[PDB]
Design a protein around this ligand. Structure first.
Ligand SMILES: *[C@@H]1O[C@H](CO)[C@@H](O)[C@H](O)[C@H]1NC(C)=O
Ligand SMILES: *[C@@H]1O[C@H](CO)[C@@H](O)[C@H](O)[C@H]1NC(C)=O
Ligand SMILES: *[C@@H]1O[C@H](CO)[C@@H](O)[C@H](O)[C@H]1NC(C)=O
Ligand SMILES: *[C@@H]1O[C@H](CO)[C@@H](O)[C@H](O)[C@H]1NC(C)=O
Ligand SMILES: *[C@@H]1O[C@H](CO)[C@@H](O)[C@H](O)[C@H]1NC(C)=O
Ligand SMILES: *[C@@H]1O[C@H](CO)[C@@H](O)[C@H](O)[C@H]1NC(C)=O
Ligand SMILES: *[C@@H]1O[C@H](CO)[C@@H](O)[C@H](O)[C@H]1NC(C)=O
Ligand SMILES: *[C@@H]1O[C@H](CO)[C@@H](O)[C@H](O)[C@H]1NC(C)=O
Ligand SMILES: *[C@@H]1O[C@H](CO)[C@@H](O)[C@H](O)[C@H]1NC(C)=O
Ligand SMILES: *[C@@H]1O[C@H](CO)[C@@H](O)[C@H](O)[C@H]1NC(C)=O
Ligand SMILES: *[C@@H]1O[C@H](CO)[C@@H](O)[C@H](O)[C@H]1NC(C)=O
Ligand SMILES: *[C@@H]1O[C@H](CO)[C@@H](O)[C@H](O)[C@H]1NC(C)=O
Ligand SMILES: *[C@@H]1O[C@H](CO)[C@@H](O)[C@H](O)[C@H]1NC(C)=O
Ligand SMILES: *[C@@H]1O[C@H](CO)[C@@H](O)[C@H](O)[C@H]1NC(C)=O
Ligand SMILES: *[C@@H]1O[C@H](CO)[C@@H](O)[C@H](O)[C@H]1NC(C)=O
Ligand SMILES: *[C@@H]1O[C@H](CO)[C@@H](O)[C@H](O)[C@H]1NC(C)=O
Ligand SMILES: *[C@@H]1O[C@H](CO)[C@@H](O)[C@H](O)[C@H]1NC(C)=O
Ligand SMILES: *[C@@H]1O[C@H](CO)[C@@H](O)[C@H](O)[C@H]1NC(C)=O
Ligand SMILES: *[C@@H]1O[C@H](CO)[C@@H](O)[C@H](O)[C@H]1NC(C)=O
Ligand SMILES: *[C@@H]1O[C@H](CO)[C@@H](O)[C@H](O)[C@H]1NC(C)=O
Ligand SMILES: *[C@@H]1O[C@H](CO)[C@@H](O)[C@H](O)[C@H]1NC(C)=O
Ligand SMILES: *[C@@H]1O[C@H](CO)[C@@H](O)[C@H](O)[C@H]1NC(C)=O
Ligand SMILES: *[C@@H]1O[C@H](CO)[C@@H](O)[C@H](O)[C@H]1NC(C)=O
Ligand SMILES: *[C@@H]1O[C@H](CO)[C@@H](O)[C@H](O)[C@H]1NC(C)=O
Ligand SMILES: *[C@@H]1O[C@H](CO)[C@@H](O)[C@H](O)[C@H]1NC(C)=O
Ligand SMILES: *[C@@H]1O[C@H](CO)[C@@H](O)[C@H](O)[C@H]1NC(C)=O
Ligand SMILES: *[C@@H]1O[C@H](CO)[C@@H](O)[C@H](O)[C@H]1NC(C)=O
Ligand SMILES: *[C@@H]1O[C@H](CO)[C@@H](O)[C@H](O)[C@H]1NC(C)=O
Ligand SMILES: *[C@@H]1O[C@H](CO)[C@@H](O)[C@H](O)[C@H]1NC(C)=O
Ligand SMILES: *[C@@H]1O[C@H](CO)[C@@H](O)[C@H](O)[C@H]1NC(C)=O
Ligand SMILES: *[C@@H]1O[C@H](CO)[C@@H](O)[C@H](O)[C@H]1NC(C)=O
Ligand SMILES: *[C@@H]1O[C@H](CO)[C@@H](O)[C@H](O)[C@H]1NC(C)=O
Ligand SMILES: *[C@@H]1O[C@H](CO)[C@@H](O)[C@H](O)[C@H]1NC(C)=O
Ligand SMILES: *[C@@H]1O[C@H](CO)[C@@H](O)[C@H](O)[C@H]1NC(C)=O
Ligand SMILES: *[C@@H]1O[C@H](CO)[C@@H](O)[C@H](O)[C@H]1NC(C)=O
Ligand SMILES: *[C@@H]1O[C@H](CO)[C@@H](O)[C@H](O)[C@H]1NC(C)=O
Ligand SMILES: *[C@@H]1O[C@H](CO)[C@@H](O)[C@H](O)[C@H]1NC(C)=O
Ligand SMILES: *[C@@H]1O[C@H](CO)[C@@H](O)[C@H](O)[C@H]1NC(C)=O
Ligand SMILES: *[C@@H]1O[C@H](CO)[C@@H](O)[C@H](O)[C@H]1NC(C)=O
Ligand SMILES: *[C@@H]1O[C@H](CO)[C@@H](O)[C@H](O)[C@H]1NC(C)=O
Lengths: 135, 135, 135, 135, 135, 135, 135, 135, 135, 135
């Protein structure tokens, strides 16, 4: 990635900022700018490319062959019992929360068993994350 | 990705900002700008490319062959019992929440068993995330 | 992706902003701008490309062969009992919510068993996400 | 994707903004602009391309062969009992909600068993998401 | 990655900042700037490349062969019981929360069993993370 | 009064009481009784008795002469307000009574201004008094 | 008063009491009784008795002469307000009573201003008094 | 008063009491009784008795002469306010009573201003008094 | 008073008491009794008795003459306020009572201003007094 | 008073008491009793008795003459406020009582201003007094 940028407030080439009650007198500004950008990226010079896979099985016997891919959850138990037995009292509950499984951003490209891959793969994630604000 | 950008408030090439009760006197501004951008990206020079897969099975016997792909949940149990037995009291509940499974952004490109892939894959995710604000 | 941009408030090439009770006197502005952008992207020079798959089975016997693709949920149980037995009391419930399974944005391109793919795949997701605001 | 943009409030090439009770005196503005954009994208130079798949089965016997594609839910149970037995009390419920399965945007391109694909696939999702606002 | 940048507040080439009630007298500014950037990246000069895999099994017998990919959860139990038995007292709960499994950003490129990969893979993650602010 | 008697249960001269499952064998009872009572009471031996009253008023003047006998109530106020404002409750009232002025036995012989009395006056009061029994 | 008697249970001259499962064998009872009572009471031997009252008023003037006998109540105020404002509660009232002025036995012989009395006056009061029994 | 008697349970001249499961064998009882009572009481031997009162008023003037007999109540105030404001509670009231003015036995013989009395006056009061029994 | 008697349980001349499971064998009882009582009481031997009162007023003037007999209450105030403000509690009231003015036995013979009395006056009061028994 | 007696349980001339499971064998009882009582009391031997009172007022002036008999209450104030403000507690009140003015036995013979009395006056009071018993 030639250019990746996280700029919180302001991004600019040339910035003239006059802010919060200043007195701005005689000014002359002369800006002479020549800018050239030439981008050649991911150009590929390739005569011949071969992707070839071959499998042969003969005079063979297979019984109870098991291939199980990734990300198996099987047996997972979430038990979160909450019991409140307020008899004769005062209870104030403000900004109270319970969360079990929260997934914001899930990015998954390739999960397989057998893979032949020729090329380019790029993942870019940018975020501002504020979970809980109260009061 | 040639250009990826997270600019919180303002993005500009040339910015003249006069803000919050300033006094802006005699100014002359002369801007002379020449800008050239030439973009050649992902150009590919390819004579011959072959993707070929072959399978042959002969004089073979297969029994109880099991292939199970990824992301298997099988047995998952969520038990969240809540019991409130307020008898003779005062209870104020403001900004209270329960969430079990929350998925905001799920991006998945390729899940398989056998894959031959020639090319380019790009995933870009940008977000501002504020979950809970109260009060 | 040549240009991907997250600009919170304002994006502009040349910006003259006069805001919040300023006094704007004698100004002369001369802007002379020449801009050229030439975009050649994803051009491909390809003489011959072959995608070929062949399978032959002979003198073979197959019994109980099982292929199960990805994303199998099987057995999932959500139990969320809520019991409220307010007898002689005061209960105020404001901004209270329960959510089990919430999916905002799901993007899935390709899930298979056997795939041969030649080309380009691009996924871009941009969002501003505010879940709960109350009070 | 040459240009993808998330601009919250305002996007413009040249912006003259006079806002909130300013006094705007003698100004002369001269803007001389020449802009050329040439877009050649996804041009493909291809002489011969062949997509060919062949299967032959002979002198073979198959019994109980099972292929099951992805996204199988099988057995899923949602039990959310709510019982309220208010006897002699005061209950105020404002901004209260229960949601089990909410799907806003689901985008799925290709799910199969066997796929040969030549070409280009692009998915772009942009949204502003505010779930619950009350009070 | 030629350029990766985390700029908290402001990024600019030339910045003239007049802020917080200054008095700005006679100034003349002359800026003469010529800037050229030429980017050739990821260009590859390749005559012939071959990716080839072959497997043959003959006169062999296989029984109870088990291959299980990564990320197996098997048996996981979350037990978080909470019981409150307030009898005749005063309880104020403000900014109280319980969270079991929270995943913000998960990026996974390739998990497999057998993989042959020719190319380039890039992952960039930038975020500002504030979890809980209250009071 | 020669004989005044309060005998709660039984009064008798000679009492043979066989009670509550006794065995009463050979008995011979011989009772020889001689009883003489001679009553001379309130015999009066009187030759001459004179009751004489005389009043004479002469050459006299009387104005605003006021004689007021006994037992004057004049101004008496009984105020017993009872207000019951049962809103949403349970009230059981069993054996509840209000009494202001209760007079059981009033015996008055002589009230006068001027009295001359020769003789005998006797008042005898006997009672069993149980006011309130409940439950 | 020659004989005044308060005998709670039993009064008798000769009492043979066989009670509560006794065995009463050979008995011979011989009772020989001679009883003489001679009562001479209140016999009076009187030759001459004179009751004489005389009043004479002459050459006299009387104005605003006031004679007021006994037992004057004039101004008496009984204020017994009872207010019950049971809102949301449980009240059980069993054996509850309010009494202001209760007079059981009032015996008054002579109230006057001027009295001449020759003779005998006797008052006898006998009672068993149980006011409130409950439960 | 020759004989005044308070006998709680039993009064008798000769008492043979066989009680509570005794065995009563050979008995012979011989009772020989002679009893003489002679009562001469209140016999009076009187030749001459004179009761004489005389009043004479002459050449006299009387103005604002006030004679007020005994037992004057004038101004008496009974204020017994009772207020019960049970909100959300439990109140059990058993055997509860309020009494202001209770008079059981009032015996008054003579109240006057001027009295001449010749004779005999006797007052006898006998009672068993139990006010409140509960439970 | 020749005979005044307070006998709690039993009064008798001759008492044979066989009580609580005794064995009563051979007995012979011979009782020989002679009893004589002669009562001469209050006999009076009187020849001449004179009760004489005389008043004369002459050439006299009387103004504002005030004679007020005994037992004057004038101004008496009873204030007994009771306020119970049970909010959210438990109150059990058993055997609770309030009494202001209770008079059981009032015996008054003579109250006057001027009294001449010849004779005999006797007052006898006997009682068993139990006020409050509960539980 | 010749005979005044307080006998708690039993009074008798001759008492044979067989009580609480005794064995009573051969007994012979011979009782020979002669009893004589002669009562001469309050006999009076009187020839001549004179009660005489005389008042004369002449040539006299009386103004504001005030005679006030005994037992004057004038101004008496009873203030007994009771306030109970039980909020959220437990109060058990058993055997609780308030009494202000309790008079059991009042015996008054003579109150006057001027009294001439010839004779005999006797007052006898006997009681068993138990006020409060509980529990
Ligand atoms: C600069 O500004 C001042 C303002 O007081 C003005 O008098 C003066 O002429 C200006 N000079 C130039 C060169 O513009
Ligand atoms: C502006 O820049 C160009 C760049 O080649 C130059 O030729 C020209 O003379 C400059 N003019 C001024 C006024 O600076
Ligand atoms: C690569 O591209 C050039 C033109 O840019 C062409 O002359 C050349 O033949 C291409 N390569 C092959 C192997 O054909
Ligand atoms: C395959 O698994 C089953 C049960 O898991 C088992 O009974 C069987 O014997 C296995 N296969 C072989 C060839 O052992
Ligand atoms: C600058 O502004 C001032 C304002 O006071 C004016 O008098 C003066 O003429 C201006 N000068 C020029 C060169 O514009
Ligand atoms: C503006 O820039 C161009 C760039 O070639 C230059 O030729 C020209 O002289 C400049 N003019 C001025 C007034 O700066
Ligand atoms: C590549 O493109 C050029 C023209 O840009 C063409 O002359 C050449 O023949 C192409 N390559 C092949 C292998 O044909
Ligand atoms: C396949 O599985 C079943 C049950 O899981 C089992 O009974 C059978 O024996 C297995 N196949 C072989 C060839 O063992
Ligand atoms: C600048 O503005 C002022 C306003 O006070 C004016 O008097 C003056 O003539 C202006 N100068 C020019 C050069 O426009
Ligand atoms: C404007 O820019 C062009 C760019 O070639 C230049 O030729 C011309 O002289 C410029 N004119 C002015 C007034 O700056
Ligand atoms: C590629 O395109 C050019 C024209 O742009 C053409 O002359 C050439 O023949 C093409 N390539 C092939 C292999 O034909
Ligand atoms: C296939 O599965 C069934 C039940 O799961 C089993 O009974 C059978 O034996 C299996 N096939 C073979 C060839 O074992
Ligand atoms: C600038 O504006 C002012 C307003 O006060 C005016 O007097 C003056 O003539 C103007 N100057 C020009 C050059 O327009
Ligand atoms: C405007 O720009 C063009 C660009 O070629 C230039 O030729 C021309 O001279 C410019 N005119 C002015 C007045 O700036
Ligand atoms: C296919 O499945 C059925 C039931 O699942 C089973 O009875 C049968 O045996 C299986 N086929 C073979 C060839 O075993
Ligand atoms: C600088 O500013 C002052 C303002 O007081 C002005 O008098 C003076 O003429 C200015 N000088 C120049 C060279 O602009
Ligand atoms: C501006 O920079 C260019 C760069 O080549 C130069 O030729 C020109 O003379 C410069 N002009 C000025 C006024 O500095
Ligand atoms: C590498 O690229 C050059 C041109 O930049 C080309 O002449 C040369 O043939 C390429 N290498 C091979 C092995 O073809
Ligand atoms: C590489 O590209 C050049 C043109 O840039 C071309 O002449 C050459 O033939 C290419 N390489 C091969 C091996 O063809
Ligand atoms: C495969 O596993 C099963 C159970 O796990 C077992 O009974 C069987 O014997 C295994 N296979 C062999 C060949 O042992
Ligand atoms: C007394 O009674 C008994 C009863 O058993 C009897 O046998 C006996 O004859 C009796 N005796 C007399 C004297 O009556
Ligand atoms: C009974 O009593 C009288 C009394 O005088 C007597 O004369 C008589 O003899 C008695 N008789 C018996 C059998 O006791
Ligand atoms: C009698 O009473 C009245 C009013 O009470 C009064 O006006 C009058 O004067 C009185 N009599 C005399 C003689 O004063
Ligand atoms: C007394 O009683 C008994 C009873 O057993 C009897 O046998 C006996 O004869 C009796 N004797 C007389 C004298 O009555
Ligand atoms: C009974 O009593 C009288 C009394 O005078 C006596 O004369 C008689 O003899 C007695 N008789 C007996 C049997 O006791
Ligand atoms: C009294 O009574 C007797 C008779 O009992 C009688 O002879 C006598 O005369 C009486 N007294 C007078 C004074 O007469
Ligand atoms: C009698 O009373 C009245 C009012 O109470 C009063 O006015 C009057 O003067 C009184 N009599 C005399 C003689 O004063
Ligand atoms: C007394 O009683 C007994 C009872 O056992 C009896 O045998 C006996 O004869 C009795 N004797 C007399 C004298 O009555
Ligand atoms: C009974 O008593 C009287 C009394 O006088 C006597 O004369 C008699 O003899 C007695 N008799 C007996 C049997 O005791
Ligand atoms: C008293 O009574 C007797 C008779 O009992 C009688 O003879 C006598 O005369 C009486 N007294 C007078 C004074 O008469
Ligand atoms: C009697 O009383 C009244 C009022 O109480 C008073 O006015 C009057 O003067 C009194 N009598 C005399 C004679 O003073
Ligand atoms: C006394 O009693 C006994 C009872 O055992 C009896 O045998 C005996 O005869 C009795 N004696 C007399 C004198 O009664
Ligand atoms: C009984 O008593 C009297 C009293 O006088 C006597 O004369 C008699 O003899 C007595 N008799 C006996 C049996 O004791
Ligand atoms: C008293 O009484 C006797 C008789 O009991 C009588 O003779 C006598 O005369 C009486 N007294 C007078 C004074 O008369
Ligand atoms: C009697 O009382 C009244 C008021 O109490 C008073 O005014 C009056 O003067 C009194 N009498 C005399 C004679 O003073
Ligand atoms: C006394 O009693 C006994 C009882 O055992 C009896 O045997 C005996 O005869 C009795 N004696 C007399 C004198 O009664
Ligand atoms: C009883 O007592 C009297 C008293 O006088 C006497 O004469 C008699 O003899 C006594 N008798 C006996 C049996 O004791
Ligand atoms: C006293 O009493 C006696 C008789 O008991 C009598 O004779 C006598 O006269 C009395 N006294 C006077 C003074 O009379
Ligand atoms: C007293 O009483 C006696 C008789 O008991 C009588 O004779 C006598 O006369 C009385 N006294 C007077 C003074 O009369
Ligand atoms: C009597 O009392 C009253 C008020 O108490 C007073 O005014 C008056 O003067 C008194 N009498 C005399 C004679 O003073």
């Amino acid at each position: 990635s030639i250019d990746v940028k996280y700029i919180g407030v302001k991004s600019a080439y040339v910035s003239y900022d006059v802010q919060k009650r200043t007195i701005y007198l005689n000014i002359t500004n002369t800006l002479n700018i020549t800018n050239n950008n030439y981008y050649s990226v991911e150009v590929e010079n390739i005569t011949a490319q071969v992707q070839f896979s071959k499998t042969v099985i003969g005079k063979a016997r297979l019984n109870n062959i098991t291939i199980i891919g990734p990300l198996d959850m099987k047996q997972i138990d979430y038990t979160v019992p909450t019991v409140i037995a307020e008899e004769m009292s005062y209870m104030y509950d403000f900004c109270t929360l319970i969360s079990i499984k929260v997934h914001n951003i899930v990015l998954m490209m390739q999960v397989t068993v057998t893979t032949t891959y020729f090329g380019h793969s790029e993942q870019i994630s940018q975020e501002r994350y504020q979970y809980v604000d109260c009061g």
